[PDB]
Ligand binder design. Structure first.
Ligand SMILES: OC[C@H]1O[C@H](Sc2ccc(Cl)c(Cl)c2)[C@H](O)[C@@H](n2cc(-c3csc(O)n3)nn2)[C@H]1O
Ligand SMILES: OC[C@H]1O[C@H](Sc2ccc(Cl)c(Cl)c2)[C@H](O)[C@@H](n2cc(-c3csc(O)n3)nn2)[C@H]1O
Lengths: 133, 133
């Protein structure tokens, strides 16, 4: 599957910027952030058509392997077969996700990690760049 | 200790660009590329003053945990404190390392890996950006 990065040491307030190519026939893509694959403060899942949703962003946490309560957004600034960029940061209370087209939303920080050490990508998205603050 | 990235799927001819800030008091830094931590097609180690060398790039391979034969460059386009970007690519014959100041050198491809899946950074270099093209 997609790129996996560890040992990231992203601190509160630091921005993690990811640019990638959405596949022409994309169904969805994922960015996961947290401590490890079983402990995610953010699962970020734009669904073009996948997992029972169309053109919807679904976010969740994972704690000791258990998905939390889902959150769905009402905006979908992504298109199959294009370049897309997202930027993420956090504090003890919320993650902030910066989308294309100036849209931004918050997702609650339910793990309270001191630092985000793990990121992974998956689905129909080819990472072109990852920038750290 | 720095970022570790896996599942990179870097293919021959593709460029991996890594940009970081060299510490103001830097002794050395490392970029490791290969299959996993024990199997490196390139250990890239600019030594300001470390491991017995001054202002020298040392490169090596690692196969099943064992270091190969060292290769030393004469060029040293790095300065303590300064941002630096290094770009790496490979073919079946050699890795090519593109340095600051327009310099490039080749290092033999000793492991014949189909793809480079692993990168890690270490020492006195704070990673700012990793790009794939
Ligand atoms: O909540 C987020 C998750 O929702 C469901 S599981 C789920 C369903 C209903 C509820 Cl009420 C809950 Cl709490 C969880 C997805 O299957 C899962 N998911 C996508 C993928 C994936 C990997 S690569 C690709 O393109 N999609 N891997 N796991 C995840 O997005
Ligand atoms: O060949 C490359 C290696 O040369 C010597 S061991 C070595 C010595 C003599 C010979 Cl003949 C051989 Cl074959 C191997 C270094 O100790 C080692 N090295 C650096 C570091 C390190 C980590 S972060 C930082 O800034 N430097 N961790 N291991 C590596 O550079």
């Amino acid at each position: 599957c997609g790129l996996v990065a560890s040992n990231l040491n992203l601190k509160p307030g630091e921005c993690l910027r990811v640019r990638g190519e959405v596949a022409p026939d994309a169904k969805s893509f994922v960015l996961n952030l947290g401590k490890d694959s079983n402990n995610l403060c953010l699962h970020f899942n734009p669904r073009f058509n996948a997992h029972g949703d169309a053109n919807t962003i679904v976010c969740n946490s994972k704690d000791g392997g258990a998905w939390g309560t889902e959150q769905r957004e009402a905006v979908f600034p992504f298109q199959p077969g294009s370049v897309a960029e997202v930027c993420i940061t956090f504090d003890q209370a919320n993650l902030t996700v910066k989308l294309p087209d100036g849209y931004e939303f918050k997702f609650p920080n339910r793990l309270n990690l001191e630092a985000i050490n793990y990121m992974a990508a998956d689905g129909d998205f080819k990472i072109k760049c990852v920038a750290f603050d």
